[PDB]
Design a protein around this ligand. Sequence first.
Ligand SMILES: *[C@@H]1O[C@H](CO)[C@@H](O)[C@H](O)[C@H]1NC(C)=O
Ligand SMILES: Nc1ncnc2[nH]cnc12
Length: 246
Amino acid sequence: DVSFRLSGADPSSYGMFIKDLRNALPHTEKVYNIPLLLPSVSGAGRYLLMHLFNYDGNTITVAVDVTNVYIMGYLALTTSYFFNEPAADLASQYVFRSARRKITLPYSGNYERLQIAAGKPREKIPIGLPALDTAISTLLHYDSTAAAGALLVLIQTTAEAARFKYIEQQIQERAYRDEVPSSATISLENSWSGLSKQIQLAQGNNGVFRTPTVLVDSKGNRVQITNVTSNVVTSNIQLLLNTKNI
Ligand SMILES: *[C@@H]1O[C@H](CO)[C@@H](O)[C@H](O)[C@H]1NC(C)=O
Ligand SMILES: Nc1ncnc2[nH]cnc12
C-alpha cells in the first residue's frame, strides 16, 4: 500500500507519495527507459490500495488497477463505492470485501461521464493539494454529484501525476493554492494511451512514432510529437500503458 497525508503536506512529501505510487506498479520491462505496465495481473494483486488522509486525519482507501493506473473505487468508513462499469464491478470482488455496504456510483469512471455528472469540464475545476484535501472530505459522505467533482480532482492529483512528471510538478506548484489545470496538463491526460502506444511502436521503428501525437505545450502552443527524442518521452511520461491494453 502507499499513503499520503494532507496534514503537513508540502511539495516534497507529495513528491514522495507520487514516487511511492509509481514504485508500487509492477513492471518487468522498460521501454526507452520508461517502465512498461503489465498486460494483466490476476486476483487481488491487480489492485493497489492508496490510503489518503485529509487535513483532519480522516481517511479513504482508493483502489487502483496496477496495469493502467485506473481508480476503480474507494472505501470511506464502512461503505465501499465503485464506478458503474464492468472493470470496477470485477474489482469489487477483490477489494474492500469487509465493507458493510457497497454503493455503485451512478456513472462510469471515464472523464466524459464524470464531467457530465459534475456539471463541469475539468478545465474549470481547480486542482492542487487543497482541492485534494476537499475531495477526500467530500468522498467521506456520499453525494453523487459532489463526488464526481471530487473524483476528477482525486484522479488528476494521483494517477495523472504518477503518469506524467509535468502533472506532478503542476500539483506541487498548487501545494497551497488550487488552480485549474493548464491546457498542457489536459492535453497530456488525454494523450497517455496514444503516447504509450507510439513509444512502444517506436521500438522497431528506429524511435520514430508510427503516428504523430498532437499535444499543447507550456506557453499554450499546439505541438506534434513524432519521435522518442521529444522531452515528453525523455523527461515527462513516467509509465506506459501496455499496447495489449490499447
Ligand atoms: C524528432 O523530434 C524533433 C522535435 O522534438 C524534430 O525536430 C526532429 O527533426 C525529429 N527527428 C526525427 C529523426 O524525426
Ligand atoms: N478512473 C480513472 N482513474 C485513473 N485515470 C483516469 N482517467 C480517466 N478516468 C480515470
